[PDB]
Design a protein around this ligand. Structure first.
Ligand code: MG
Ligand code: ZN
Ligand code: ZN
Lengths: 65, 283, 258, 94, 48, 54, 76, 152
RNA sequence: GACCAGGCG
């Protein structure tokens, strides 16, 4: 649905740095350099951002009251 | 984790891994009978026949419908309905309310009121239940390897690689040679390489990236081409004698949960014809 | 004797070398840091009206995952029975937009979210979300939401490379590129394993006989990082104090047996 | 932490340790193994689910000293080097 | 017994009694489907 | 000398007898289920029942 | 004629095999820490199935203790 | 093995006898330890499986050796009643005593057992012939001579 | 209660 707050394996907080990564990778930058700049060294954390889908935005159209 | 059993980390579960929710819908109708006889939505009086305990009619509004977002246990009543009296009992309405299944639990999610195609009223109620992984739940990859959770381990007891990685899952090496699923190892290497490189890996059948290219890329990135690493024992605190294969593998959670299979009977209803116990978990 | 030296002290991570202790002590310290150090975290949420696209439990879990600051002086963070002081957090949002973690008002100024940029939920037009949250002290061994950070270690080894290998310069250049310290002597090149160093494929033939690893006894390279809840040195000191308190209580209980 | 004695005879002592896990037990037994008057010592967890917090200990000594004083001496040693490590860390961190 | 209800597709409040009402329809929309709104009570949920 | 079928039948008969009022021929620790008492009686060799064999 | 023949007839359907009362069913998981002649039982099932017992002079105390716990505490 | 079960989604049923006669019959006639031998071919049916063989090979192979803490921990974990470690077999550097895998495994066998045969790992049959000859000539060979001519 | 369809070992 929405970006997880913490990496599952090691608990590092990565929930606040998804939008910056998406924007800088849509701006034509090298994804590896962007991930290195953001400070994610262990690949257990890179796996979280590299493979996420924002499915929240296309389910708010249906309201249940 | 012997005989196709798997071991899962606890802290990973506590952080939202493989969490899911279960839904179920109940239906009630205010039917019309031959003549002036009809059903009614109403909180039953203590006088009527078959009147359950007053504890069950706990969170029913005076119109006969349950308030949304209220906790419900087994045998709790969702919609209160009183049928016309059954001819032999005169002047005694029959209680035929709709109740939650005797072995379920959840929270009411939504209530809908509408009218059927011939004028009768109709209500539909849904129940939401949260389910966390436990013992007996079935996990399975896409290469044909299936199993159930055998044990849940605290984080500090799991081994860790010398580069700072803690496994999220443990699989027995005895299950690999007999099934001959080399694609799982290929996928593990490719997934680790893809996660390191920041770009997804193509594996489309006969056109995907060859194995040797992935191994060479993994060697370039700093790790070992065999895919092995050095780990330290989580209890004793010293490294094991052998390098351990480790990677990233896609996994799926099937819908054969243990919470829908447990069943036990001591005494209950019996068949009318043969006076033997009934058939089915549902009854 | 026992001594400690520092190798890197960046903002929220410290790497140091621990020398002169047995493996059991290091593993005990790691486990104590991972499990016993207390921290504030959300434990119960009361909802008044929630019209978002997410159920109550998902929002409660997301709130529980947010790190919180923890004062050091006020409470006893090394006692074996923790206090039950409760801090209440409140929120009220409406209309379109993202409800960031920086919109939480706290009764006690010492307990606030560390990072005010974590999204919580996305709201559409006409929706509302009002609730109250309660936070309390806890331990890592009970739930993963109370963990202060992440700790691991490794042995301290020196890799010897004989100069009889015709292309040792490539290995030396690779070691320099990785960043490991390198000392060169006659007919031998010494590499210090501050970070893991895996031999490439081409040189695997010589490994074992001409490339061998030497392990320095009783030396480990620790690594501690935090999410901002507590400073790292405070974490280490609290863990050591907890170990001492456990030892003292065991001594007393054993003494009263006889 | 409660101590529950199971069997006490001659130089052998065997007891539970309620409210504890691998963290303290492994350190205690490793500290004990350094004593030259301890002939056999070990610990185990009987079941990871039902008894995850009740390690079982066995201490057998030569007979020069009783098991209880050996346990006390071993427990006193941890309190010393832990304090030394704390002092060194607090000196080095600044 | 008067209760509040909300239209399925318009969202605007409809006020009627189910006991004697012979047809269910929003006075604003042709729809015959209605919701039952949530009560105003401080529900308490654990954070585990 | 007993065949295992005879042993099982004898133990079952004695266990049924004890649970109806028959006194126990040996001392037993408290809380013991009647079947265990019958088993203890059998292994102590004091069972009075005998089997007739054609 | 049809009630007496086939795999659902009165002979092979009810007389030879029939549904029983005290039984339970669930999934299995490995456990190597118990001896080979033991089995693990969930506390939910153990509180449903019951074993009748006759009170005697050597088990009156335990039975009286069990009755006091009622049907909702485990030993009861 | 006797159940032919595998932990991948299998289910099993459980029945509880109610009368004392039924309980006695189940206790005396239907015990698990009474069915180790299979009636079809007169051989063991309940035994080791999967890791129970690989671990045994790792323990009893040639060159396996263990330190004091590992030996004490494994013996305590297994449940063996021991209060004194046997004599060490060889000394590592810095004089650390070491015990072999065979010495550890011998602590489980009964005291008066004696048997010999050939297992699946036989590659060169010209080396087992010498051991068979030595056993045949003298019915109780000197343990040093056997240990000098050991073979997997 | 009987039928039909689909799954699990
Ligand atoms: Mg199977
Ligand atoms: Zn991570
Ligand atoms: Zn409308």
């Amino acid at each position: 649905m929405i970006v997880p707050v913490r990496c599952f394996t090691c608990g590092k907080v990565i929930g606040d740095k998804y939008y910056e990564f998406k924007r800088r990778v849509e701006a034509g930058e090298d994804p590896e350099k962007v991930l290195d700049d953001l400070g994610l060294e262990r690949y257990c954390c890179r796996r979280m951002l590299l493979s996420h889908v924002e499915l929240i935005d296309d389910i708010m159209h249906y309201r249940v009251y | 984790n012997m005989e196709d059993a798997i071991i899962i980390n606890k802290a990973s579960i506590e952080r939202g891994l493989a969490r899911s929710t279960f839904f179920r819908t109940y239906e009630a109708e205010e039917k019309k009978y031959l003549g002036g006889q009809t059903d009614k939505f109403e909180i039953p009086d203590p006088t009527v026949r078959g009147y359950r305990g007053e504890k069950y009619y706990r969170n029913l509004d005076e119109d006969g419908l349950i308030f949304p977002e209220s906790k419900v246990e087994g045998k709790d009543v969702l919609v209160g309905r009183t049928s016309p009296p059954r001819f032999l009992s005169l002047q005694e309405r029959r209680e035929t309310s709709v109740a939650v299944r005797p072995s379920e639990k959840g929270v009411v999610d939504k209530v809908i009121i509408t009218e059927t195609g011939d004028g009768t009223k109709l209500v539909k109620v849904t129940v939401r239940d949260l389910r966390i992984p436990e013992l007996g739940d079935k996990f399975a990859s896409r290469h044909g390897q299936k199993g159930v959770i055998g044990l849940i381990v605290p984080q500090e007891d799991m081994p860790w690689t010398e580069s700072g990685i803690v496994p999220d899952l443990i699989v027995n090496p005895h299950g690999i040679p007999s099934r001959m699923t080399v694609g799982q190892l290929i996928e593990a290497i490719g997934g680790k390489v893809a996660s390191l490189k920041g770009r997804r890996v193509d594996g489309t059948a006969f056109i995907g990236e060859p194995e040797e290219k992935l191994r060479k890329e993994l060697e370039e990135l700093g790790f070992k081409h065999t895919g092995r690493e050095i780990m330290y024992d989580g209890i004793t605190g010293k490294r094991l004698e052998a390098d351990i294969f480790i990677g990233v593998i896609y996994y799926q959670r099937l819908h054969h949960m243990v919470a829908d299979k447990i069943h036990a009977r001591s005494r209950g209803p019996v068949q009318v014809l043969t006076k033997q116990p009934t058939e089915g978990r549902a009854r | 004797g026992i001594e400690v030296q520092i190798l890197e002290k960046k903002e929220d991570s410290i790497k140091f070398v621990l020398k002169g202790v047995h493996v059991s002590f290091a593993n005990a310290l790691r486990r104590t840091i991972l499990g016993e150090v207390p921290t504030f975290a959300v434990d119960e949420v009361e909802f008044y009206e929630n019209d978002s696209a997410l159920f109550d439990e998902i929002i409660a879990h997301r709130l529980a995952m947010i790190p919180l600051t923890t004062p050091v002086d006020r409470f006893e963070l090394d006692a074996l029975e923790l206090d039950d002081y409760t801090v209440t957090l409140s929120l009220e949002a409406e209309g379109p937009g993202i409800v960031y973690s920086g919109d939480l008002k706290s009764d006690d100024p010492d307990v606030k979210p560390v990072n005010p940029n974590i999204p919580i939920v996305k709201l559409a037009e006409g929706q509302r979300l009002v609730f109250n949250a309660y936070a309390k002290l806890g331990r890592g061994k009970d739930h993963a939401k109370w963990q202060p950070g992440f700790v691991y270690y490794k042995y301290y080894t020196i890799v010897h490379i004989s100069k009889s290998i015709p292309e040792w310069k490539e290995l030396k250049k690779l070691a320099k590129k990785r960043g490991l310290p390198v000392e060169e002597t006659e007919e031998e090149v010494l590499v210090t394993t501050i970070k893991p160093f895996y031999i490439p494929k081409d040189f695997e033939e010589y490994e074992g006989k001409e490339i061998w690893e030497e392990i320095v006894p009783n030396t480990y390279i620790f690594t501690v990082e935090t999410n901002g809840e507590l400073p790292v040195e405070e974490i280490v000191s609290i863990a050591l104090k907890i170990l001492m308190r456990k030892a003292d209580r065991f001594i007393s209980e054993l003494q009263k047996l006889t | 932490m409660k101590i529950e004695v199971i069997k006490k005879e001659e130089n052998l002592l065997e007891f539970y340790l309620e409210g504890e896990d691998h963290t303290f037990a492994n350190l205690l037994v490793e500290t004990l193994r350094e004593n030259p008057h301890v002939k056999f010592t070990a610990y185990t967890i009987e079941h990871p689910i039902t008894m995850a917090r009740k390690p079982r200990f066995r201490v057998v000594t030569d007979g020069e000293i009783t098991p209880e004083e050996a346990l006390e001496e071993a427990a006193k040693k941890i309190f010393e080097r832990a304090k030394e490590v704390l002092e060194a860390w607090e000196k080095a961190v600044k | 017994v008067e209760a509040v209800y909300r239209c399925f597709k318009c969202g605007r409040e409809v006020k009627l009694d189910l006991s004697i009402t012979r047809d269910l329809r929003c006075p604003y929309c042709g729809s015959k489907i209605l919701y039952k709104p949530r009560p105003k009570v401080p529900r308490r949920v654990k954070a585990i | 000398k007993y065949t295992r079928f005879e042993k099982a039948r004898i133990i079952g008969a004695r266990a049924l007898q004890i649970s109806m009022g028959a006194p126990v021929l040996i001392d037993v620790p408290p809380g013991i289920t009647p079947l265990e008492a019958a088993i203890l009686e059998f292994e102590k060799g004091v069972i009075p029942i005998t089997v007739i064999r054609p | 004629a049809q009630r007496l023949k086939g795999k659902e007839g009165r002979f092979r359907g009810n007389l030879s095999g029939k549904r029983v009362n005290f039984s339970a069913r669930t999934v299995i998981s490995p456990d190597p820490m118990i001896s080979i002649n033991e089995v693990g039982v969930p506390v939910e099932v153990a509180m449903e199935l019951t074993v009748p017992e006759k009170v005697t002079e050597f088990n009156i105390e335990r039975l009286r203790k069990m009755v006091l716990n009622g049907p909702d505490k485990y030993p009861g | 093995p006797p159940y032919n079960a595998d932990f991948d989604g299998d289910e099993m049923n459980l029945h509880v006898p109610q009368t004392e006669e039924a309980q006695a019959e189940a206790r005396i006639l239907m015990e698990v330890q009474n069915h180790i031998i299979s009636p079809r071919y007169g051989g063991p049916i309940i035994g080791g499986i999967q890791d129970h063989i690989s671990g045994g090979y790792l323990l009893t192979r040639e060159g396996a050796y263990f330190t004091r803490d590992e030996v004490e921990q494994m013996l305590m974990f297994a449940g063996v009643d021991i209060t004194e470690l046997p004599e060490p077999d060889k000394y590592d550097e810095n004089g650390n005593p070491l015990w072999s895998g065979k010495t550890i495994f011998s602590l489980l066998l009964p005291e008066d057992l004696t048997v010999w045969y050939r297992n699946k790992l036989c590659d060169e049959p010209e080396r087992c012939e010498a051991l068979e000859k030595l056993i045949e000539e003298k019915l109780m060979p000197d343990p040093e001579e056997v240990r000098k001519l050991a073979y997997d």
